[PDB]
């Protein structure tokens, strides 16, 4: 009840969450060359700043594009005991902005 | 806006008995159902409790829990779930069993 | 006497966590 | 560890005498005379003659052990002297130790993570490459 | 149906209106004095215990039976004869006092089977007896805190020594499996494609 109770001090180090951002990247990066299973039409990736990026050609003014990067904590090397499987956390772009 | 009343020494005698206080998890709780923490002047008192935690103050205090209880009271949430009983339950038990 | 002596309690033994406080920070995560 | 278990065990010993006393004062003591013997057998709570005598025997025995414990836990004992001089040099000696120690880490660990650094861009290089090339 | 006592009254007499009456007051630099003066934390030093400042005294509690300090570096064990013993001198001196107290107790059995009411007496040489092995083994302990202290102070050094080795370690593996596969360059297009029409040829 502390744990998931319990919040941080307020202060986060900039330089810091950089320094995160870059290790989390590069995280999905050692996840992705050997993750297991990836789809044949997201085959090019790119692993963007903070995130993973996946363009597909689509219509309705936009392209089908996803970005995904994860925050279970247990699996983040586990993620590789894990080939099967991970949570993965999406950020897709489309012309609509709010939905 | 009625004139302060204090006196020096013993409000400090009294701010370490509050601390302790704090350690107690059921006064939290009643604490929380007479909605105290509805009051932003007690916020700010926590603040000021925040003295207690410098060495020669700290070497004063007799239950260490109220350090950590404070910092589990910065999260508001936290606020309305000392409210309930259940998790007050939980909080003494989760003592009880360290102790 | 006193002297100061370091230790950082080396005796005792997360990213959701993380992303809560950036989504706090810098608002949404896309930016 | 050693000296609070001592501690312990002469506690240990006072909380034996008044139980001791006690127990014997509760337990059945009427004893005839002359007269025949009378009870008022529910205050009284009796137990057997020879369940007494056993009793206090167990009992002498158990206080006699537990003073031979306190005994040879005073022989566990290990003499020092109250004076801190040695244990206090010791402690700075320590101090100093793990400071000088802290220090060549520190430079090593700065160095470590530059070195990372540059090996984590070469990877990067590598991984997009790989990828783009093969598919 | 179960209660506890409310916090000060001047915790109800924050305000961030006064807060920032009292800023003004230091923007500036009676009530914003008595204000400040709230606000300032003034530990006291010494004095006061109640709801000591320092550890209980034997003497303070009742009279001690013997006195006794040891030298730095040095410590006095000799030969007196009761069995005949030769040991450490602290040690000899509790388990004297042991041994006595087992035989005021076996006095205090017979005092209550002959007189009962004399053991006030009794007793009082058993809780004299028991205060002083307790004295003395607390003039025993800081230095057992103290090599506790040691013990803990040996381990953050062994975990330290230890993490700095396993460094050392981590980074010469690291520049040597960063030298393998060195092929450092920058605008790799020009090198994926003279890669693919070296792979054609």
């Given amino acids: 009840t502390s744990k998931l109770y319990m919040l941080s001090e307020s202060p986060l180090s900039t330089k810091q969450i950089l320094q995160t951002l870059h290790a989390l990247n590069m995280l999905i990066r050692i996840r992705l060359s050997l993750y297991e299973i990836i789809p044949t039409p997201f085959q090019h990736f790119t692993i963007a700043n903070g995130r993973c990026t996946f363009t597909v050609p689509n219509e309705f003014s936009v392209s089908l594009t996803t970005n995904s990067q994860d925050p279970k904590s247990t699996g983040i090397s586990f993620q590789w005991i894990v080939v099967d499987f991970q949570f993965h956390l999406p950020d897709f772009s489309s012309t609509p902005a709010k939905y | 806006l009625l004139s302060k009343v204090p006196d020096d020494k013993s409000r400090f005698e009294i701010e370490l008995e509050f601390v302790q206080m704090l350690s107690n998890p059921w006064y939290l709780n009643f604490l929380a159902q007479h909605k105290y923490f509805e009051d932003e002047a007690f916020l700010q008192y926590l603040e000021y409790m925040e003295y207690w935690r410098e060495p020669e103050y700290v070497k004063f205090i007799i239950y260490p829990t109220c350090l950590h209880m404070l910092t589990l009271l910065k999260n508001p949430q936290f606020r309305n779930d000392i409210s309930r009983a259940d998790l007050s339950k939980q909080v003494n038990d989760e003592i009880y069993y360290e102790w | ?31 | 560890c050693r000296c609070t278990q001592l501690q312990d065990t002469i506690d240990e010993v006072a909380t034996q005498f008044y139980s001791s006393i006690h127990y014997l004062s509760s337990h059945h003591d009427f004893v005839p005379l002359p007269g025949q013997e009378k009870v008022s057998d529910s205050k009284v709570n009796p137990i057997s003659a020879e369940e007494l005598q056993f009793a206090q025997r167990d009992l002498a025995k158990d206080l006699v052990t537990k003073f031979m414990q306190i005994d040879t836990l005073i022989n566990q004992l290990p003499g020092i002297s109250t004076a801190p001089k040695h244990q206090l040099e010791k402690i700075k000696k320590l101090q100093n130790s793990i400071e000088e120690k802290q220090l060549e880490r520190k430079s090593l660990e700065s160095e470590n993570e530059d070195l990372k650094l540059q090996l984590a861009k070469r990877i990067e290089t590598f991984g997009r490459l790989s990828c783009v090339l093969f598919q | 149906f179960s209660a506890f006592p409310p916090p000060p009254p001047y915790y109800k007499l924050f305000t961030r209106e006064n807060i920032e009456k009292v800023i003004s007051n230091m923007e500036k630099e009676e009530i914003e004095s008595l204000a400040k003066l709230f606000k300032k934390p003034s530990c006291l030093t010494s004095g006061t215990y109640q709801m000591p400042l320092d550890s209980q005294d034997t003497g303070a509690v009742s009279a001690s039976s013997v006195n006794e300090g040891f030298r730095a570096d040095q410590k006095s064990k000799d030969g007196e004869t009761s069995d005949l013993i030769k040991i450490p001198r602290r040690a000899y001196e509790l388990r004297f006092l042991s041994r006595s107290l087992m035989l005021n107790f076996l006095e205090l059995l017979g005092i209550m089977a002959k007189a009962p009411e004399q053991f006030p007496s009794k007793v009082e040489n058993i809780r004299v007896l028991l205060l002083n092995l307790h004295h003395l083994i607390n003039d025993y302990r800081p230095h057992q805190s103290r090599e506790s202290l040691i013990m803990l102070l040996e381990k953050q050094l062994k975990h330290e020594e230890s993490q700095v080795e396993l460094l050392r370690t981590h980074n010469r593996q690291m520049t040597e499996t960063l030298e393998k596969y060195k092929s450092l360059d920058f605008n790799m297009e020009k090198e994926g494609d003279v890669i693919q029409q070296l792979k054609s040829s």
Avoid: A, M, V, Y
Wanted: aromatic share 10%.
């Fill in chain 3, 1 to 31: 006497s006193l002297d100061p002596e370091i230790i950082g309690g080396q005796n005792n033994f997360n990213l959701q966590q993380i992303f809560q406080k950036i989504i706090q920070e810098r608002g949404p995560f896309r930016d």
